Design a protein around this ligand. Structure first.
Ligand SMILES: Nc1ncnc2c1ncn2[C@@H]1O[C@H](COP(=O)(O)OP(=O)(O)OP(=O)(O)O)[C@@H](O)[C@H]1O
Ligand SMILES: [Mg+2]
Length: 243
């Protein structure tokens, strides 16, 4: 799924088309629900590595010891995500939550191209194209001492900045209409009856902290609650916890 014709979004797609063929690491900056893993996927499938594996790992999800083992692997065997991504692309989400230990080890892999291993096993050479994502201000975290300056000096070969939905105002009604129509098909309404001006005001004035994921859920819920093709959708249900 890839909607949007806001110039800011089209510029991202152009940038991605040029970055994909490189073996260089790419940093994606963007809020939740803006499509970051989908962009990472595009970088993979437009690259020369497209027939190789596309592996993903969310850094925020795992505790420090588990993240270490999941990313770099362990034995006394559990192949880590770098190993699984050999010949392909590894996507690291919520990068700024990585503990400083993992950050240092990550830089080592990037700069030396091998996974450390003792206990008898020879080191593992890996060939992986890295894509990372975050919505943190990484330069600010470097100043705070919570992100490694040397990792950022190396990792940010270039940066893809995904615009939030609220800065893609023209895409809001375009996407809302698309999601509404899909929901009409799912609940077997003959036609999407349109959005009233009140509904449009509600959609366009909301700041969409959850961006596209949130827009889809809000619109689907609103269409379902409306439940008819006989007149236009007027009530946009942003918050389902209200009664
Ligand atoms: N260009 C797009 N066109 C249509 N839908 C999109 C687009 N980008 C994202 N979405 C929708 O938004 C939802 C979330 O996408 P995605 O997980 O890639 O965002 P994200 O930035 O990775 O969010 P998070 O970081 O919270 O996981 C998906 O269900 C997807 O359908
Ligand atoms: Mg994601």
């Amino acid at each position: 799924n890839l909607l949007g014709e806001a110039n800011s979004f089209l510029e991202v797609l152009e940038q991605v088309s040029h970055l994909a063929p490189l073996d260089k690491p790419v940093l994606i900056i963007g809020e939740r629900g803006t499509g970051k893993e989908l962009i990472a996927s595009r970088l993979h499938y437009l690259s020369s590595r497209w027939q190789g594996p596309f592996i993903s790992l969310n850094c925020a999800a795992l505790n420090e010891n588990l993240l270490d083992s999941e990313l770099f692997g362990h034995e006394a065997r559990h192949p880590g995500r770098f190993e699984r991504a050999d010949g392909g692309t590894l996507f690291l989400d919520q990068l700024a939550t990585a503990p400083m230990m993992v950050q240092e080890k990550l830089l080592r892999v990037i700069e030396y191209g091998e996974l450390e291993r003792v206990g008898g096993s020879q080191p593992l050479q890996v060939n992986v194209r890295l894509v990372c994502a975050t919505n943190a201000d990484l330069p600010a975290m470097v100043n705070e001492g919570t992100f490694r300056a040397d990792l950022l000096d190396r990792l940010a070969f270039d940066v893809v900045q995904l615009p939030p939905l609220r800065e893609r105002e023209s895409d809001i009604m375009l996407m809302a209409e698309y999601f509404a129509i899909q929901m009409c098909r799912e609940i077997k309404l003959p036609l999407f009856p349109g959005f009233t001006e009140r509904a449009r005001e509600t959609l366009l004035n909301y700041r969409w902290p959850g961006n596209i994921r949130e827009l889809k859920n809000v619109v689907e819920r609103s269409v379902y609650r409306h439940g008819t093709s006989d007149y236009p959708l007027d009530d946009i249900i942003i918050d389902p916890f209200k009664r």
